[PDB]
Assembly symmetry: D2
Homo-oligomer: 180 residues x 4
């Protein structure tokens, strides 16, 4: 019983992830050299990428995190979600950088973006490791993108199937037999 | 030995409060007869008034509550507050009735008002037991008001000094010897 | 369309509730005359009763509130729940009084009781408006009880059916046709 | 202009951290091969270490997180803290692995340890990257330790001074001129 045996194929190895993280980190450090931004991750999936990205971003910055959950029907259509943990600091006047593992529908993330704008953020940018424009249900594009990927359910490096596989150091596609 | 000894004068007796609450309840019941509104109280102070008001509001309605805290000096400027407990249901398409004990500066309350408007509320109205408009730091008008009271620090019927005196059935003014 | 028309029969009218609230309040005020207890309500159902009870409790006290939600299978068997809003003050050394609308299974409430004991409460007592020893799934008895009632689903005065009827000023039994 | 100029000395380089993390990950993967543990990080500081550790832990596991804050002077005594974000799943019957960046006083961590034991955890173990046992205000031993470090205030790899320097890929000591 080993996780590797559940993966049909690899999409992005650890080597390529760390390479792209090094690239995005250096770009972000230069873009944010004249401000102390508030970098925000949405639990749970964004944590591994956010960890590796920010330690390749050589500039002063603060971290924070938010936890949200679905309301049921309203979340599936407008992205409105229940805030379980709000930010530990105010958004007003801050340059916000949202760090995400993947953008698929974009519903929830667009709700948070405009929420931070309602809270009078100085700016709101997005950096995502993976982008799936296929399943997009609102006009939302990330400012920084590590990889664009097909509409195929992947796992690893923060992305789960029923709360497991988040700890893989790579991203891959599960064998169809894994699903249940 | 007893709280009444700390009270210098009674500003609004229990009898007066229940008379106006009976009045407000009937008005609100008429205004919301063709909708199932979401009646929201902001902890902790609004709890006694919200309880007695909806007891007098003979119409179908749901209850919910929110808890917030300040970000320090940031809240004092725009009223932005940390959400500790969001609503249990979505705001979109709902008629929101915010139940408050008192509106003084209005900073925090206006922030929640436009938060719910950002969340696509069908309508957002405010009913407060006490209105202290002389303290406003923002333009915010309550739609339903029990009493308008002078620019003074009161206590009782939800309103606390250092977390005490909320359980008084009336609204009064403390003797200056109490402040420390 | 009026709520009264949905009630098959009344269990406790408003007059009897306020009478019992006056009785329990005076008992609690004497028992807690030599301490400033922390009175805690569990949202949402306990709010109306907690409001009326504490304003008939003529002694110094503090209020607080907690919000919890179910985990699924673990909540149905052991009462363990997710804390959505924790207390705003520490429990250590405090005399805790939990104010509840009804005790049926007792699972959740016994989890919170022993949680406060784990947090080194000086004492943990319970006051409940209604008690249904029928559906009890753990040995838990309230210290103060307003009314013992049969194993029949009631509504009003904080108790809901699908989030409605909480605002009734009395407790009654819905007509069977109301259910869906 | 750059953070490295604020650092007086590097205590544990990035290369050393990843070597030990690789070691810890393999050990933990062996110890948890016959269970699906719940790996819990305490925000914010544990995020970088937790990310790299589970990347090296080739076994099935779930991730979760908690957020807390202090009650003022009360936390300093028994470590009791306000829960801002509880776990997303129940603790009962689960093998809990708490992932920490550093253990200094141990007050807060011991409180969470016995909280999870109160919630009927099957087991509760602790892995910390850094151990500062000379600062203990309670008897708490970590089961897995990366490095033991002297009684000194460090920064980097999750550890902050006034919310900054978390994003350093190493652990260092600030120049005294930085403290204000
Ligand atoms: N494993 C995996 N997950 C995907 C994929 N695409 C989207 N998700 C996740 O599914 C959840 C719901 O996503 P959607 O709302 O449909 O799309 P969105 O990501 O654009 O919002 C999100 O987080 P969540 O799962 O609700 O939270 P968490 O897992 O981040 O804690 C998202 O991260 C994928 O290809 N693989
Ligand atoms: N006792 C008392 N309180 C007043 C009075 N006027 C305002 N407050 C309360 O003080 C807190 C902050 O007041 P302001 O910022 O000045 O006014 P605002 O609430 O309208 O913004 C609010 O709640 P809070 O105290 O932060 O929350 P909670 O106590 O409801 O939990 C508000 O309800 C008064 O005359 N007497
Ligand atoms: N209307 C009504 N409700 C009852 C009755 N008996 C129990 N409940 C409610 O159902 C929910 C689950 O109760 P149980 O866990 O089965 O029993 P317990 O009350 O002893 O814990 C509780 O709150 P909750 O509904 O989950 O939260 P909230 O409604 O207090 O927000 C409780 O208040 C009843 O006769 N009538
Ligand atoms: N930078 C740094 N921090 C240390 C050091 N030792 C302890 N801390 C952090 O300070 C906070 C309180 O520390 P103590 O109460 O003294 O030690 P304890 O965490 O073991 O109880 C904790 O997290 P926190 O800061 O309150 O939370 P967060 O920063 O993880 O969000 C802890 O992680 C150190 O040498 N350097
Ligand atoms: Mg997931
Ligand atoms: Mg107050
Ligand atoms: Mg209910
Ligand atoms: Mg810190």
């Amino acid at each position: 019983a080993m996780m590797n045996q559940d993966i049909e194929k690899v999409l992005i190895s650890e080597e390529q992830i760390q390479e792209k993280v090094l690239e995005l980190g250096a770009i972000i450090a230069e873009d944010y050299k004249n401000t102390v931004p508030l970098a925000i991750g949405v639990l749970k999936g964004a944590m591994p990428f956010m960890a590796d990205l920010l330690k390749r971003t050589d500039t002063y910055l603060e971290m924070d995190f938010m936890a949200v959950s679905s309301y049921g029907h309203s979340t599936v259509s407008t992205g409105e979600v229940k805030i379980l943990k709000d930010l530990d600091t105010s958004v007003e006047g801050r340059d916000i950088l949202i760090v995400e593992d993947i953008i698929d529908s974009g519903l929830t993330l667009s709700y948070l973006v405009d929420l931070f704008k309602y809270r009078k953020a100085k700016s709101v940018k997005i950096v995502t490791l993976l982008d799936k424009p296929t399943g997009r249900k609102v006009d939302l594009k990330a400012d920084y993108v590590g990889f664009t990927v097909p509409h195929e359910f992947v796992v690893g490096y923060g992305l789960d199937y029923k709360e497991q596989y988040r700890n893989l150091p790579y991203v891959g596609v599960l064998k169809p037999s894994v699903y249940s």
